[PDB]
Each structure stands twice: as C-alpha cells, then as structure tokens.
C-alpha cells in the first residue's frame, strides 16, 4: 500500500464522530455548512466532501472557484458556496458548475447577471455583510439596503442567502460578536421590511456554534471543529467533544552513531555531546514541517524526541536519547498524537493550529483510515 | 486565460538566463545536474525539467520517488536521481521508472538487487558518503569502503555514482567544506585503489559551484541558483548573475474606506487611526503567505504597502496610504519584484529564501511566461 516516506493520515471515523457531536448541539432545522476550504484544512477536500455527502450536510463552503470545481469534477453534488471573492473571469465557470457566489457589490451582481443571462442560467449568490471584521461585504447601511434591493431584482440572479463573519468569537468576550450581530440584524430587519425573501441566513462559525446558541439562524458554518480542533482555548470546550483527524507521519530513513563533537545539518548549529544516536527522517520544510520552528519534536515508539540541527528541505535529524528498539522504516509521528499536536507546533511558531494543518504540502499523500483500515490513498503528484 | 485569483508566475526566460551563466562557469566536460526537488523549489518541476531537457542538462535530482515518477509520467526521459531515502515499498517503482537511487548501506543495496533480479532489470545507484553533515551516507572509513566494494559486485546494481553534500559551503569560511572534501577524497582514492570504477563523482552545490571551482568532479548539482537566488549572502555573488524566476501575484478584490478607530480582521489586532483606504486581497496563509510574518508587505502599482491585521487563511488586508489609481481587480505582487523579495520575507520570518519558495500552496496555479507571453497554465487542482 503506502509507497511514500511521508504522509498524512486521516481518520474518517473521527470526522464522523466530530460532526455527529456537532449535530447534537443543533435543532433539527438548523442547516450545517461544512467548510472545506483549503483542501479541507489540509485533510483533502474531495474525500471529506464525500463523507459529508454521506452524512447529509446541507452546504459546503470553499474559498476559491477551483476548489469547488474540484469537488464537482469528482462528482460532488452538494451545494457549494465560495466564501470569498470571485474574479470576473471565473463567473461563467461558477455558474456552469453551480458554485454559489459571494457578492458585496451591486456592480458585481450586475456583471454576474449579465453572464448568467447570456447562458440562460440563473446564478445563485450569497450577500456578505461587513459586521466589523472589515474584510469583505456590504457596509451595514441604507445604501447597501437599497443596493441589495436592486440586486435582488436582477433576473438571472437568485439571492439565496446573506451572511456575515465574526472577528472575535473564539475569545472570552462576546461583546464584539453581539455587536456584530446587531448590524446583521439591522440588515435583516430592513430587507424583510422591504419584502426581500432571503432563504438562508447565517452568521456562525465554529466558535459561535459552540458558544452562541442564539445565533443559529438558518445555517451554521463549521470548520475547524470538524477536524477535531478547537478555535481557541477560550471556547467552551465541554460543549463539544473532539477527536483530531490527522496525523502527520514518516519513517525512519537512517539511523547511526555519531561521535562526540560532530555537527549536524546545515550551519552545524548542533553538536553531539558524547556519543549520540541519530536518526534521519525524510520529512522537511518543503513538506510543511517548517524550518521556523525552534523546538521541533517527534514521537517515535511513544517517546518524544528532539529534532536536532537545522531542518532541511526534505529531511530532519532526531536524537535518540531514550532507549528503544528502532530501525530504519519505523514510523515517526510529527503531530497528531500524544504530546505532539498541531497546537504544540503552533504555539512554538506563534501561529494557530489552523495554519499548521494547512501547511501540509502537495507531496504528502493523504491516506484515509476507516474502522482502523486503510481505505484510500491519494497522491497529489501521481496519476 | 487566468481564472484564479492568485497565482505564481514563472519566467522561463529567466531560468534560461540563469542556466546559461551557470554553464558559463564550467568546463566542456563537467556535467550539470539540475536539482528540482520539491516541485522545482516550487516553480513546477515538470515544466522546469522540460526546459532543462531542452537545454540539454545531464541529470535531474529529486527528493522523493514520486517526484521522479511524476516527471516520468510527464514524458521526461533524462536520468533522475533521488538524492534521498527510498523505502522498500518504493524500490520496484524506482527500478521500473528509471529512478537512480541513493544508497548508503550495503543492506539496502542487497534488497534493491534482489528486487532488481526479479524484474530482470539492472538497478542504478549512487552511493552517498557522509562527510560531515551527518545526514545520510556512509561513514568515511575503511569498513565502508569494503562494503561499497561488495555492493558494486551485485549483479543488477549498476553503481553509477558517488557523492556527498556540504554543510557550510555557503559560508565565508570554507574550512569545513574542504574538510568534507577530503573525507570524500579518501573514499574515492580507496575505491580507485580497489578498482571500483564509479562513472560520476559529484559533491558541489550551488554554493560550491560558485565559490569552489576546484570541486567540480564529474558533476555539480545546481539548485537554488537555477531559480535565480543565492544560497547565502556570503557567496561570491559577482561570479554569477541571476534573475529570480518566480513572482507571487494576486489581485485586488475589495476596496473601501474605513472609518477611524475600527478594527480589522482576527482579534482586531489592528485599529484604524483616521480614514484609511483598505484593500482586501485574496491570498492568505493557506497559499503559503504565512501568518507568521511580523511585517508583511505588498507592492502595488510600484509602491510598497503594509499588510494590516492578522493574515487569514485565504485573505489579507492592505493599507493604501500613498495615492494611486487602483481598482478592484488590479494586480498585487507578494514577492518576486522590486522591493518585495523572498529574501525579505525570509529575513522577517527568520528563515531562508529556500523555504519561502517552497511554501507556495497547491492551489496557487503556476503560470508560465516566455517572451513576455503566457504560454502555459497549470492547475494542481483541476482537470
């Protein structure tokens, strides 16, 4: 089966578990969007979507046209929303591929409308509101109320949805978040006033789903929690119980004994003290195991070990100070188990777990496990 | 043509320029191995090999079996070396695809042979000597020589080459490097003494190529210089002229004016002081524009601007203070031009230009320019 040295193992049961737990927090009538943007946060968008189809999620969310197109190429039938910007050049492909678009200007809706009209297709859109992330969206005002009314008028535009996103929900203070909600409420009340039916309204991310039950609306958007990681440590964790789905793994490729005072790797930034046992592992920075780390660690045979020297593009060196029966080809865990977590690496980096998950590079095959079985291998390099 | 928001643009003319100069440094006998591990350090391996084949390089190098196989699968016929570890699981595929394997043990060589025997195909190998980077390779001792002698005696092994790698060649002092060279010399002398023929002997990287003219053997391996970047700032730069080949480009997707005192993006880490023009660009950390950056910058319409806020997965915010005529849709350059360099980003990060080049995500399409013409677009996601 696995012919790569380094790979990412995704446990399907875990995803199933997480989602079901997610469901137990929701009333029968709240739609779930599974956010699988960025190759499903590194987990593999196509496979996750398949799973999400099996489990009857309502919506899928992507960041890019191609990302959605990818799923469609692989026979995904669920509804897809592109959470972000769609260049004019992609409008036509979006329509043809049934990618719901996000819009924050009437101008855009008009170009889209022109294209759909040409194709004799109604193009479906979701309107973003800027409630204070200040990233994309209509500003929450009367003009924008009018602009939206005009938008909804266009034929060849089906204004399915309206949504906003939250800056601060993962944090302890929800003041900004509720303030963000009112601004959305303002847009909602007004368009409703003007008789504009928007079928799906949604504002909640993972943190909001956990922390903020009064914010359901039509749909919620789950991202990180789907993969068994928390948004922050300040969310109400007891509310939702999670297993991480991913392990980053590798194999010992060389092991040897090194004399005292020998330097390792580029720059010779480490030297052995005494005779040391050194294992080389074929993962490096170009796999997404970043050189920036500083206190990089690995798990072998249940023991944590320090990565010594400079991390190379394709390789790392590890010191074996505990004594254990190891040999070339034994498995190594970079994160995903025990003490080695995406969270740990992230803290060391000063980034967030989301980035570390996303970091896994193209050449790392994604290997899928179900009921403790290898069920699927995906290469991004090979046919 | 380009339907993606964010792409990497590769100038072939630049690679050709870079190679030529490199070629200009060498005798009419010294082989070049084009080192294209990690998707050609991110520039797209297949396309880069194609060019390399066109300009007649001798050998190609990669980090993984699949990287080699990807090339083969794309019609590349040049000899390929996997500089790294090969798993047992991958031996059959290497033999079949004409991938030269690096070997640093007799035991692994026997295993290869046994496999080569059953396929009826001679398996071609290069032996790695550990001369002081302590990564992979034989220890340079007599016992090693003996084994190599033994190795060479195996039937479906063609021992084509021997090589080592340098830790500190990019440094001002070359004491370690020459020290490393001697160890190799030792191995090479002993083996000649034993009459083991060894067709290609090689040790030099880009740095050695530039500064260490005496270390050509049969072949030198060029990586970083091929892409028009320097291994370190301490090399003899003026001995080789380079143009960088890659540009990370995105497009403006939202512009707005922001009231004073208003927070942007995650955790509201930036607050607006007065009325500020803010552009939203569809690149983020999951494209490899890492969140880790303390001082992210972007260049638009000739001018550099600060990225403001925490970087998102797929999005950033840019503060436009100087006045220029900009329109949603206009191009944005993250790196590859002028003041915005990979080196800058690297310095900020605390890393090296090599990692930045590598960080480019799967979803960033690779766009190839020749003669000021777009000539090829590549999606890693579609088709």
Residue numbers in the entry:
A (entry chain B), B (entry chain A): 3 to 385
Direct quotes from the study:
The third structure is that of the K271T mutant enzyme in complex with PLP (CdAlrK271T). To prevent this cleavage, the lysine at position 271 was mutated to a threonine: K271T. Thr was chosen because homologous Alrs from S. aureus, M. tuberculosis, B. anthracis and G. stearothermophilus that are readily purified and crystallized have a Thr at position 271. The structure of CdAlrK271T is the most complete structure and each monomer has ordered main-chain and side-chain electron-density maps for 383 of 385 amino acids with the two disordered residues are at the N-terminus. The topology of CdAlrK271T was chosen to describe the overall enzyme topology since it is the most complete structure. The secondary structure of each monomer is approximately 25% strands, 26% α-helices, 5% 310-helices and 44% loop and turns. CdAlrK271T had a significantly higher catalytic activity than CdAlrWT. Kinetic analyses reveal that the K271T mutant CdAlr has the highest catalytic constants reported to date for any Alr. Lys271 lies on a loop in the substrate entryway of the active site and it has previously been shown that mutations in this region affect the activity of EcAlr. Accordingly, the high catalytic activity of CdAlrK271T could arise from the formation of a tight dimer that hardly dissociates.
Alanine racemase (Alr) is a pyridoxal-5′-phosphate (PLP)-dependent enzyme that catalyzes the reversible racemization of l- and d-alanine. Since d-alanine is an essential component of the bacterial cell-wall peptidoglycan, and there are no known Alr homologs in humans, this enzyme is being tested as an antibiotic target. Three crystal structures of C. difficile Alr (CdAlr), corresponding to the complex with PLP, the complex with cycloserine and a K271T mutant form of the enzyme with bound PLP, are presented. The structures are prototypical Alr homodimers with two active sites in which the cofactor PLP and cycloserine are localized.
